[PDB]
Amino acid sequence: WGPGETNDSTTVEPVLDGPYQPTTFNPPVDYWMLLAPTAAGVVVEGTNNTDRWLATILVEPNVTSETRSYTLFGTQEQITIANASQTQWKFIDVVKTTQNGSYSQYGPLQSTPKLYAVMKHNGKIYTYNGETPNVTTKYYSTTNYDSVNMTAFCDFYIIPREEESTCTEYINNGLANEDIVVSKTSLWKEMQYNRDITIRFKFASSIVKSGGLGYKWSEISFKPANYQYTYTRDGEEVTAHTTCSVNGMNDFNFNGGSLPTDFVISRYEVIKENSYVYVDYWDDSQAFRNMVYVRSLAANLNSVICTGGDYSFALPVGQWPVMTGGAVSLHSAGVTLSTQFTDFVSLNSLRFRFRLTVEEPSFSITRTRVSRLYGLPAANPNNGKEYYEVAGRFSLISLVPSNDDYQT
Amino acid sequence: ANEDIVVSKTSLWKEMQYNRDITIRFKFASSIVKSGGLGYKWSEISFKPANYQYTYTRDGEEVTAHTTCSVNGMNDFNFNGGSLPTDFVISRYEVIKENSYVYVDYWDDSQAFRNMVYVRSLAANLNSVICTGGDYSFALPVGQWPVMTGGAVSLHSAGVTLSTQFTDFVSLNSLRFRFRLTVEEPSF
Amino acid sequence: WGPGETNDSTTVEPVLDGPYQPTTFNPPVDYWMLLAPTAAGVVVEGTN
Numbered sequence: 001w002g003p004g005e006t007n008d009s010t011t012v013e014p015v016l017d018g019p020y021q022p023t024t025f026n027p028p029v030d031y032w033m034l035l036a037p038t039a040a041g042v043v044v045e046g047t048n049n050t051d052r053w054l055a056t057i058l059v060e061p062n063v064t065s066e067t068r069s070y071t072l073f074g075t076q077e078q079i080t081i082a083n084a085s086q087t088q089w090k091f092i093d094v095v096k097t098t099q100n101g102s103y104s105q106y107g108p109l110q111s112t113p114k115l116y117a118v119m120k121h122n123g124k125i126y127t128y129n130g131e132t133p134n135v136t137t138k139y140y141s142t143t144n145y146d147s148v149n150m151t152a153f154c155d156f157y158i159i160p161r162e163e164e165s166t167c168t169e170y171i172n173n174g175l176a177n178e179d180i181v182v183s184k185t186s187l188w189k190e191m192q193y194n195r196d197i198t199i200r201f202k203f204a205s206s207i208v209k210s211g212g213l214g215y216k217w218s219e220i221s222f223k224p225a226n227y228q229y230t231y232t233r234d235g236e237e238v239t240a241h242t243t244c245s246v247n248g249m250n251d252f253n254f255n256g257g258s259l260p261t262d263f264v265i266s267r268y269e270v271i272k273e274n275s276y277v278y279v280d281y282w283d284d285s286q287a288f289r290n291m292v293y294v295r296s297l298a299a300n301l302n303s304v305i306c307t308g309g310d311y312s313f314a315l316p317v318g319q320w321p322v323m324t325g326g327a328v329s330l331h332s333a334g335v336t337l338s339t340q341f342t343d344f345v346s347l348n349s350l351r352f353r354f355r356l357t358v359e360e361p362s363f364s365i366t367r368t369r370v371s372r373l374y375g376l377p378a379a380n381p382n383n384g385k386e387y388y389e390v391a392g393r394f395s396l397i398s399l400v401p402s403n404d405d406y407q408t
Numbered sequence: 409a410n411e412d413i414v415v416s417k418t419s420l421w422k423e424m425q426y427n428r429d430i431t432i433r434f435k436f437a438s439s440i441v442k443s444g445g446l447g448y449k450w451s452e453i454s455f456k457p458a459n460y461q462y463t464y465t466r467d468g469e470e471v472t473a474h475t476t477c478s479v480n481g482m483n484d485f486n487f488n489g490g491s492l493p494t495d496f497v498i499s500r501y502e503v504i505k506e507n508s509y510v511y512v513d514y515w516d517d518s519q520a521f522r523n524m525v526y527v528r529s530l531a532a533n534l535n536s537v538i539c540t541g542g543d544y545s546f547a548l549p550v551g552q553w554p555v556m557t558g559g560a561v562s563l564h565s566a567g568v569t570l571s572t573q574f575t576d577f578v579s580l581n582s583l584r585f586r587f588r589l590t591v592e593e594p595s596f
Numbered sequence: 597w598g599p600g601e602t603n604d605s606t607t608v609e610p611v612l613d614g615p616y617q618p619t620t621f622n623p624p625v626d627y628w629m630l631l632a633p634t635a636a637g638v639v640v641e642g643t644n
Contacts, residue, residue, distance in 0.1 A: 005480065008480065019488065021490075070595070105501060193411075196410070253499070393409075397415060
């Protein structure tokens with residue numbers, strides 16, 4: 001008995017984390033900001049506003065010593081620049097330490113892929129430098145490293161530090177027809193059973209987080225959940241196993257924006273009227289031993305309520321949204337038998353399909369305008385409970401061998 | 409309450425084996441929905457159960473077989489060109505891999521297939537096939553239309569499942585062959 | 597004869613498209629741009 005095959009909803013894998021628009025933000029620590037601009041000029045600025053204004057500038061290839069008017073932090077400034085490379089773009093880091101302070105150029109980096117990377121760590125700003133295909137990194141010590149913003153005026157990505165092995169190669173290279181009898185005649189009769197049943201089951205969810213800063217998730221999906229227990233019926237102790245799965249779920253997604261600090265749920269599934277919940281039940285009882293060749297199946301099962309649990313999203317900053325509310329009542333949508341035939345043995349399953357009907361209260365997510373939706377979330381379907389239960393009658397009509405027969 | 413009653417008397421049954429030559433045919437379906445906005449963001453490009461009916465001569469017997477093809481265990485991929493309204497985005501599409509399988513449900517009308525109930529055991533020996541991926545354009549209001557190309561997956565025989573839905577008097581049967589996948593060149 | 601329940605999934609009502617970031621582009625005809633500022637000053641600019 002037991003294991004069916006109804007799995008789904010797997011996902012792999014954001015590699016660049018998506019293009020982010022030109023904005024001013026404060027990326028985290030131990031994470032590399034990767035710049036791959038499309039037009040020359042200013043690319044990124046870093047400002048602490050008391051003693052540190054850094055500005056990285058991209059000079060086109062085959063540009064000689066000349067002065068240009070670049071708007072650095074909202075004000076025009078005459079910056080002198082030169083590049084000996086006829087084909088390779090040149091990154092220069094113009095820095096000052098006062099509001100009216102002097103601009104001083106550091107670097108350069110002559111690189112064909114037009115890729116640059118920066119990060120903050122332990123009181124310094126590390127950046128890429130050197131030459132291709134022999135690129136390396138350098139650093140500049142800076143006080144108050146943890147409060148400096150990094151404002152980009154061009155598209156960029158964010159890559160974790162632990163994937164430095166991928167960051168380096170990124171910077172380097174970029175992205176007849178007959179009937180045969182087998183046995184003689186046999187002897188079987190029909191036996192009708194009436195028993196009682198108490199199916200105990202539980203939900204399980206699969207939580208896969210999107211790689212990046214930590215503000216956005218990738219997948220919060222359902223997953224089949226198994227359960228074992230031991231219960232009494234008419235004085236006999238039976239050790240019953242259950243396995244709950246689902247189908248026909250509806251995929252909701254939230255997007256606060258493309259900024260790396262905006263909360264995004266690329267997908268999370270919910271059960272509604274257009275869904276079902278299957279409960280595969282099996283035990284080692286003698287009734288189930290006999291129940292192989294079955295003619296009819298019926299059962300008078302009661303209804304069960306299932307509520308949504310609270311899920312706290314661990315954001316770096318801000319008040320954590322909490323998905324709360326939601327609940328659905330169930331009713332047995334008949335029971336199906338399945339028989340999977342393997343090379344050497346056969347496997348069975350008795351799946352009680354349960355249809356769904358929404359009830360009160362609705363679920364919501366505070367501080368977020370997407371509110372007052374229906375359904376039971378996949379974030380925490382168990383609502384902190386160890387199991388749900390549905391109990392009732394079981395009425396079976398099966399085909400079994402016969403004894404004390406052949407006459408009246 | 410626990411009791412044991414009888415509904416019918418004794419009877420006689422015979423364990424009889426049937427070997428038949430089967431030629432299954434099937435097809436796939438696509439359900440491509442365009443999301444709100446300009447027309448550069450797609451919400452879903454996903455499979456759909458593909459029903460197909462056909463008639464074929466099996467050892468001179470005309471047999472009308474009805475099949476329904478689907479895939480299970482697939483993985484969810486996506487693509488992004490940017491959050492700008494003119495950038496090509498596909499939020500979630502599905503793709504079959506080695507971790508997945510292909511389930512072809514079916515039934516037909518010949519006596520041998522009308523008699524496959526109370527099966528004790530069974531097995532099928534088939535060969536492998538190939539399914540390649542075709543072309544499809546993405547209609548954009550303004551700009552060259554992206555088009556897809558490449559990809560191919562070979563199927564190899566697997567087990568069978570016989571599903572019987574009972575609602576309280578009746579039997580509702582269907583057969584279902586399974587196929588394991590090996591992704592084969594060309595890529596997509 | 598009837599097939600069993602096949603595995604499926606359906607998206608439903610992604611009505612709120614966006615939010616997008618400040619940027620420049622040529623919006624197409626037959627499409628309302630609905631702007632929602634948060635501070636005073638300029639909101640949208642346009643030039644031929």
